[PDB]
């Protein structure tokens, strides 16, 4: 009922994940920006990292690499790195042209895209769903809002519930 702003975004992501009855691993908010293209004159919507909330629940070379990257990130900013943690981390550098990829298709068409089960992810033909599935996710969800797209992921197979959709409706802006 009250139009939310960026200053409560982290709180609303936390509220979504901590209050949900199902075991969601994380939530991401993909925010809108625009990329003006000089060659066509088009102002295209681009979805990029807004914020996220990771709740949670690999070979040596991979672990050393991941731990190394965390160390380097710790440095700039100021033991095991799990697959879902890594997926969440890597997500921060992703962006999506409107209509393209899981968040882009959701936003273009103002859609709820609910992919539940490994086969739904790998059969979606959607690169981000495929990536989630490789990192152990079994449910991925994108819900378009007035300001972008809310994404949920889980390592469990989760069916769409009324209660989850009610919470999302109360925690983001809709037209």
């Amino acid at each position: 009922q009250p139009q939310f702003n960026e200053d409560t975004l982290q709180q609303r992501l936390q509220a979504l994940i901590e209050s949900a009855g199902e075991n969601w691993t994380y939530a991401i908010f993909w925010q809108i920006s625009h990329d003006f293209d000089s060659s066509t004159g088009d102002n295209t919507v681009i979805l990029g990292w807004g914020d996220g909330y990771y709740k949670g629940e690999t070979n040596t070379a991979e672990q050393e690499h991941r731990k190394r990257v965390i160390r380097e990130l710790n440095s700039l900013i100021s033991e095991e790195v799990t697959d879902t943690e890594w997926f969440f981390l890597v997500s921060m550098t992703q962006s999506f042209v409107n209509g393209v990829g899981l968040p882009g298709e959701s936003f273009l068409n103002s859609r709820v895209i609910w992919l539940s089960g490994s086969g739904a992810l790998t059969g979606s033909g959607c690169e981000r769903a495929g990536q989630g599935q490789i990192y152990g996710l079994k449910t991925m969800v994108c819900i378009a809002t007035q300001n972008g797209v809310v994404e949920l992921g889980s390592s469990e197979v989760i069916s769409q519930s009324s209660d989850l959709m009610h919470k999302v409706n109360n925690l983001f802006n809709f037209n």
Binding site: Q10, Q31, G48, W49, G50, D51, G52, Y54, I70, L73, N74, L76, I77, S78, E85, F88, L89, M92, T93
Partner: peptide, 18 residues
């Protein structure tokens, strides 16, 4: 680093230590 990402990184890395 974009502010949005750095802010999230900060919170993520800090929650990591627990």
């Amino acid at each position: 680093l974009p502010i949005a990402r750095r802010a999230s990184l900060h919170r993520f890395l800090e929650k990591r230590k627990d």
